[PDB]
Design a protein around this ligand. Structure first.
Ligand code: FES
Ligand code: FES
Lengths: 74, 75
């Protein structure tokens, strides 16, 4: 059994700051702690920070996304 | 007088990037960063984990409002 398609255009961000036409975050590395973990799935309730929402998203959708970690060499 | 705007979906976010990796995580030491690093949050960049402007076309096509994460040196 085969099948065709069309133009769905699913959004990545479903609910965060929808009054902002393009969500961009900018941080000075000098004011970060020893570690910051940033969300790349747009499902975190602590956006722009990762709260572990990625896990449920990957399990539900079969995806493989995860966060960006900025840290001091240590 | 009441109506909702439903945007919920069960679609994957990352369509094509490093699918042999079960969970794509990047970790960088700030001491090794230059003046400005711009990281992709849309999973459409051909330079992932870095932003290449793919988010603009995604936003246009889908009506989305995603954009990158910038880590920079204080001015
Ligand atoms: S909560 Fe989104 S990448 Fe972890
Ligand atoms: S290319 Fe993905 S956020 Fe810019």
């Amino acid at each position: 059994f085969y099948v065709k398609d069309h133009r769905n255009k699913a959004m990545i961000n479903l609910h965060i700051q929808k009054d902002n036409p393009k969500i961009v975050h900018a941080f000075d590395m000098e004011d970060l702690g020893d570690k910051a973990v940033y969300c790349r799935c747009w499902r975190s309730k602590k956006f722009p920070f990762c709260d572990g929402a990625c896990t449920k998203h990957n399990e539900e959708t079969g995806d493989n996304v995860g966060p960006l970690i900025i840290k001091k060499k240590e």
